[PDB]
Symmetry: D3
């Protein structure tokens, strides 16, 4: 990076300006998961980019997953799973584990990484200050809607209290657990929770970190990779994508139809992917806009 001439270093920074202007004072919700969460270089870069946004006057909000870590802890505790379709049933016991891992392990690692740069990160769940509630959700296996326990969707969000937190200069790191109307805590899918938080907060962008270059229309045709697409036609392509990018795509449509100006599916295996997606035009991701 030292053999690179100085006048091109200048140019790269100057080309950030249109996006610094767009994002200044705005909320950006980031779904964090995948390899961006498991490799130590990626992780550290992610935390530094969160500090970057904050030290530009941008208001990042982090929503994290943790599927594989929950599973490993269940196996360590010898908790036998029940499975309907390909879904583990979330008993009261599985939820206690899920909450303890998400909030007391996975969330903690990110908060500490970010806080290496300053007193920025703060961890929360829907339980704290009743920041958001959940509604129990069913799944459809082999055509029939079925109960798989204490798993929900975000119901309502405390928009005011959450925007207080970010105006104080803090970076919320959200673990997706929240209680229903009777106080019963549910585990929420991180991808959908992020889209819901983004719409409730009036975010300027939603970013989804995933382990992909971007959205392929006809995977695996390499020339099917797309850089921008509207919600109308993306909704039509939904039943034709692999099972893994379904929830990431649904989040994007749900957020952009909710009024979030754009959602982005970006490559979490790229170091500093947030910086490249937000402050350069050389992004590999896929941008979703309404239409």
């Amino acid at each position: 990076i030292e053999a690179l001439p100085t006048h091109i270093k200048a140019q790269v920074l100057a080309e950030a300006l249109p996006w610094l202007k767009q994002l200044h004072g705005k909320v950006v919700v980031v779904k964090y998961g995948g390899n961006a969460m498991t490799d130590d270089t990626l992780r550290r870069a992610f935390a530094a980019d969160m500090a970057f946004l904050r030290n530009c006057g941008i208001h990042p909000v982090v929503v994290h997953g943790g599927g594989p870590q929950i599973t490993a802890m269940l196996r360590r505790l010898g908790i036998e799973g029940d499975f309907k379709g390909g879904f583990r049933v979330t008993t009261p016991e599985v939820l206690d584990v899920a909450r303890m891992v998400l909030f007391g392990q996975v969330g903690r690692e990110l908060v500490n990484l970010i806080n290496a740069h300053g007193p920025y990160a703060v961890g929360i769940t829907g339980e704290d200050a009743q920041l958001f509630t959940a509604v129990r959700r069913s799944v459809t296996v082999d055509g029939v809607a079925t109960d798989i326990g204490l798993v929900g969707d975000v119901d309502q969000v405390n928009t005011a209290a959450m925007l207080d937190l970010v105006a104080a200069g803090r970076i919320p790191v959200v673990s997706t657990l929240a209680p229903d109307a009777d106080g019963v805590v549910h585990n929420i899918n991180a991808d959908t929770a992020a889209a819901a938080v983004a719409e409730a907060l009036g975010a300027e962008k939603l970013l989804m970190l995933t382990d992909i270059d971007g959205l392929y229309t006809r995977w695996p045709d390499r020339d099917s990779l797309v850089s921008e697409i509207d919600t109308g036609t993306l909704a039509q392509l939904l039943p034709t994508l692999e099972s893994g990018m379904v929830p990431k795509v649904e989040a994007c449509l749900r957020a952009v139809i909710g009024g979030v100006p754009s959602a982005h599916i970006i490559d979490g295996r790229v170091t500093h992917c947030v910086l490249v997606e937000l402050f350069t035009d050389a992004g590999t991701g896929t941008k979703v806009v309404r239409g």
Copy 2:
């Protein structure tokens, strides 16, 4: 409670007034542990008293322990302990468990209990917003000061940021983990952390919930139970008490010599012990004052 005449119900409430006046707008730090944490009626009463304080314009701050729950989780995970003296060595592995249990299990239960009354509780540790730091602590076994791993005392406290949280009408529920100056998270004894938080916040009172009637000078002489004592003579009685009330007593002296007007050791096995200690003169506890 219905056969009790109405004019004595009036008198009991009216006698709360001198203490409502003393505590209005003030911080009260409460160490929560023991049976007040394990029995479901006690627990529920505790959470309701926290809501009580808040709905009087008092600012409670809860610091909780969780020793036995950490141990049970270590045994469930098959994590073999190392012991110097009677102290488990806190390896990096034991800390991850301690943090996950304290913050992702024990803290969560209290937050949800309190939040049944309103959007009040919020959980935090020293890691969040760098609210407090830790300094690694040694112990003295058989006369020699020895390392027992990632266990510390509270070093510095972010007084301003924490008092912001309570002025917003929130009830912090603190899990005693905090990073040292190099970002390495340590587990802090809950009793001492509570005394440190109380002095840093300028609390009007520190309350220590324990499984005792109060401080006995010559346990087990029933007529040795004391209701008030000064720090000077309490410091002299310290080497003569059973090992369990040592840390609770040290917390009280350290807090009251730090300027907290009074610390109280009260009976956590009594339903609504906080209400009786703060709003009545029939408290069984022991009050510590400077002298």
Copy 3:
């Protein structure tokens, strides 16, 4: 009160919590008169309950009468009364006396009693800061509407300026005099003024202290005493009650139809009646709600 066990003292305080939650941060307007104003123990208790509300974060507003004290001062000054029906005509001279007694004697006693607990009470009339205006009122004697001088109803209220006063932590003590649109000060009935203030301020409750157990439907049948009634049927019972509880009942209907969630007619001869009505379920009063 000392022979009463401690665990029932706890229970009485804990049962206040649902009402502390309901009233926290809310305005409660209290009409003060009758024996609660003339007996020194009752008075002192009343003032202490006003301090109680304030030291819970509740915002009391006191409206007081003083009929008998005006009369005694008129007799002391040798001011001969004119009477139409059973109404003294309020000449300019009678008003000067009424204002001087209400604001410079009766209001002063309450302010000083309350202020024994802190710098809380502040006395005012509609004249100060133009806080409310009056409209001259007629009475109907023997079927004909007749002028009885400078006696009015509350016309408009300065809601903003009055709610400033209470947010400053002050307890307004209102003497019911106010000028009309031409600057001419009138004396307003205290019961009706209290209902008007309560509706203008968005009070959560209106309390009317009177010298009765509660509203009897068929006085004197002891089994006609009612604990709750709606405005629709209370309006039907109005022409059938003794002349003294008419104005207290009209105040309640007018306030609750104005949107005040409930008005209460409570026994001012009971020490700490405000505490028992607001923080216990053993109230003897009568609650009025809309319907």
Copy 4:
């Protein structure tokens, strides 16, 4: 006033500017009494000048007396006086009358007069919000210090709370009664109370309205009238003035030695004397400055 040319009307207003600049945003305490209080044209002019100051962004504070009105009310009530020296003894009964007349009659008239111009005036005494306290004072008759009942000097003043009131755009009208440390209300001499309020509030000027042209050094020599004098030499002239201007002079010295930049003894028999003293150089009054 119509035959007066327009370009001299311009000049008179333009010459106000140096004093508008000096007084803008500043407190001016005005002792109001004498004929400025009893004649209806003077009174009305006084109230209009208070509105003038307020509508310039000046913060007037009015302190009023009422000696003769108290006396007339005592005679009307048949209250026999006790006299030591030339001082009526202020029994508990005399005080109730004094307070009722000052606050419920004399203060009310001024508040209503001022409020004809806007919602400006608000009446208060030391009792309200504990705005100031009193200390019982003795008098010296025939060489010996003697008790004359519930008469005091201003002890402490709630500077913060009072300056809140004026920043809200209100004009306090103070009746000089205040409680001592035991809650016992005393009557304070209005002239001295005004000097105390002026020093506690950091007033820019104290104005004393009196029934005189100004301070005569050798009354009645017409050529002894002075327009400015320092505190050092005014203190020397004190034992040589008629009994009536003693308290007005003592107020001025006490205020100006307290740091009030200047005190002024002005002719209350002159219509709009406040306007002429503050906004013109043709004042007849006497200015006191430190030296």
Copy 5:
């Protein structure tokens, strides 16, 4: 001014009060030009009256012209003019001169004059903080609408940012230059810009200083001078007035139809004309009101 009795000095100041009340806390926009700008006594008086308004809590906003000064500078620089009709074409070169003279000479003189009284004046143009924009304007010569270069009308105004400036206690002195939507700065007629600023700011009055006694209906008939007129009939008299008072009249109609309660054409050759127009009833000007 010294031979004038003191009690009439009082009366002149007291008669200001109804207008101090009307204007307190309100915006007053003043178009400044003509002889009030060129004679040193008039100028100094003008600046002192601006300080007067400010030291009454009134918020003046000054808009200035400078036609003749631009012309003299063009002649000094040897810049040959192009003329269509009687209009100089404003080339890019003429604008640079116009802006440099208006903002860097004429505006500076006024700011310094006002600032002799305090830190009040601040100079601005539409360019600063994008406070207002311009739209290019045509003129009609001999019946045809024609381009005369970079001359415009005020397009949009930043009402919020400008009212911030005055709430800070500052007196804006506006030079009428502003950029169009493409960033191209235009010169705006000062009379029309003042009417636009007055309507955008919700001014209570617009004052137009001119070199006339007032509006004559049938100039030169001396008995045709009018003191008040409504917009409806003033619009009918527009095509019948001399070319010089056309733009001043159009400003008044445009402002008063925009909701400004009244616009005034006053004699700038009168020392302290602003003081006489605003604070006396002996104004020579012409008041415009809607109708």
Copy 6:
């Protein structure tokens, strides 16, 4: 810039982070002159970097010169110069020109350039709101201190009012003219004014744009170019540098001895020199620190 790989674009932006953290919420004063002011590409880049800083939450303050533009305007106006030493005497006439050019031409161009990015720039001089004063300065020619007219140094600065302006999100663009204590406006050297503003505002950095690579100790030895130097030894090198970098060096010493953490002499001929100096380590400039 497109053939450059994306992962190095990421790295260049990520390496900005330590300096975004250092500068966030801080004042940076920038002296703007030289070729950075005359070439249209440099100029545009400069204005974009000012918008960059602002859209990072940094508070830039621009101080500009304009020596050559004043000279050209004097020659255009045929104003014959008087010269003592190599200094033009600043007569009242020369100052009017200097002020008109600096504030009404040179300042305007920068404000409009910056404002192409948003409503950021606002132009001011010491005259506006009395933001800073000047003290007349002498020069020493051939050994003797001599008067060269209305040329000064910055005397006092209104730190509070200026920091208000930047907290509002504005970018002040300062033209260095200010009045002395008698209201007489002087022209101040831009380099020294910038150092004075930087110390008065508590700036984190002072940047001096010049037409040089950096400070050469032994110009022209290419290997004498320095990247960092302390004030102690820089003060010793002062009498040994070419006449042009003297004032730039004096500014740096005066600012850094005034407590500004570092001053920087950077190459204004480099496009985006501000971005490279502040956000990269490949700066060519010279950093001055205390020592």
